């Protein structure tokens, strides 16, 4: 049992910005990784496909997963409306980490953010469950189209996504 990999063809307002890829730490956070896997691949008939990045904060993070709301509250797991924080083994060690946005303890579901720095201020508050494998330079471009008030200077989206297992 190894970590699944995923891809996302990132699109800014529909213009292809490039493929990006991530690894999902099933090896430590199986619930979170599996929950996310299915949402990226779209195999639950919803999820990440088209569901954008809603808070892009340069050198902080790129939050997304607004697939049922549009304000940083969308998303629920494949098993149900929230699940627990699995653990805090994996920490916000630097940019290119990936962690579950939640509403506090045991309220994580389908929002994540790409850490675009060492988001150690979030250590103990969010489930790190992935990392950028590839297209880190596209995440760096995505941030140019962020702001800091999170509301982007351009709509950042996923044209397509799936697994690269």
UniProtKB/Swiss-Prot annotation:
Keyword Phosphoprotein among UniProt keywords: yes
Predominant subcellular localization, coarse grouping: cytoplasm
UniProt keyword rRNA processing, yes or no: no
Phenotype when changing residue 121 to H: No effect on peptidyl-prolyl cis-trans isomerase activity
One GO term describing the cellular component: cytosol
Post-translational modification: Acetylation at Lys-125 markedly inhibits catalysis of cis to trans isomerization and stabilizes cis rather than trans forms of the HIV-1 capsid. PPIA acetylation also antagonizes the immunosuppressive effects of cyclosporine by inhibiting the sequential steps of cyclosporine binding and calcineurin inhibition. Acetylation at Lys-125 favors its interaction with TARDBP.
Glycosylation site residues: 108
Catalytic activity as recorded in UniProt: [protein]-peptidylproline (omega=180) = [protein]-peptidylproline (omega=0)
Modes of activity regulation: Binds cyclosporin A (CsA). CsA mediates some of its effects via an inhibitory action on PPIase.
Cross-link (Glycyl lysine isopeptide (Lys-Gly) (interchain with G-Cter in SUMO2)): 28, 82
Protein's cellular compartments: Cytoplasm; Secreted; Nucleus
Effect ascribed to mutating residue 125 to R: Loss of acetylation and interaction with TARDBP
InterPro entries tied to this protein: Cyclophilin-like_dom_sf (IPR029000), Cyclophilin-type_PPIase (IPR024936), Cyclophilin-type_PPIase_CS (IPR020892), Cyclophilin-type_PPIase_dom (IPR002130)
Pfam families in the cross-refs: Pro_isomerase
Record PTM Phosphoserine, positions in chain: 77
Modified residues (Phosphothreonine): 93
GO biological process: activation of protein kinase B activity; apoptotic process; cell adhesion molecule production; cellular response to oxidative stress; endothelial cell activation; leukocyte chemotaxis; lipid droplet organization; negative regulation of oxidative stress-induced intrinsic apoptotic signaling pathway
Positions of post-translational N-acetylvaline modification: 2
Residue positions, PTM N6-acetyllysine: 28, 44, 76, 82, 125, 131, 133
Family, similarity comment: Belongs to the cyclophilin-type PPIase family. PPIase A subfamily.
Function statement: Catalyzes the cis-trans isomerization of proline imidic peptide bonds in oligopeptides. Exerts a strong chemotactic effect on leukocytes partly through activation of one of its membrane receptors BSG/CD147, initiating a signaling cascade that culminates in MAPK/ERK activation. Activates endothelial cells (ECs) in a pro-inflammatory manner by stimulating activation of NF-kappa-B and ERK, JNK and p38 MAP-kinases and by inducing expression of adhesion molecules including SELE and VCAM1. (Microbial infection) May act as a mediator between human SARS coronavirus nucleoprotein and BSG/CD147 in the process of invasion of host cells by the virus.
Protein name in the entry: Peptidyl-prolyl cis-trans isomerase A
Source organism of the structure: Homo sapiens (Human)
């Amino acid at each position: 049992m190894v970590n699944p990999t995923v891809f996302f063809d990132i699109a800014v307002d529909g213009e292809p910005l490039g493929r990006v890829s991530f690894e999902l730490f099933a090896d430590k956070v199986p619930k979170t990784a599996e929950n996310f896997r299915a949402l990226s691949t779209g195999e639950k008939g919803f999820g990440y496909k088209g569901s954008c990045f809603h808070r892009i904060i340069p050198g902080f993070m790129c939050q997304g997963g607004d697939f049922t709301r549009h304000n940083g509250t969308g998303g629920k797991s494949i098993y149900g409306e929230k699940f627990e924080d699995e653990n805090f083994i994996l920490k916000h060690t630097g940019p290119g980490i990936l962690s579950m946005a939640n509403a506090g303890p045991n309220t994580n579901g389908s929002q994540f953010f790409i850490c675009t720095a060492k988001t150690e201020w979030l250590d103990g508050k969010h489930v790190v469950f992935g990392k950028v494998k590839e297209g880190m330079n596209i995440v760096e471009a995505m941030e140019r189209f962020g702001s800091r008030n999170g509301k982007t200077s351009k709509k950042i989206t996923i044209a397509d996504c799936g697994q690269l297992e």
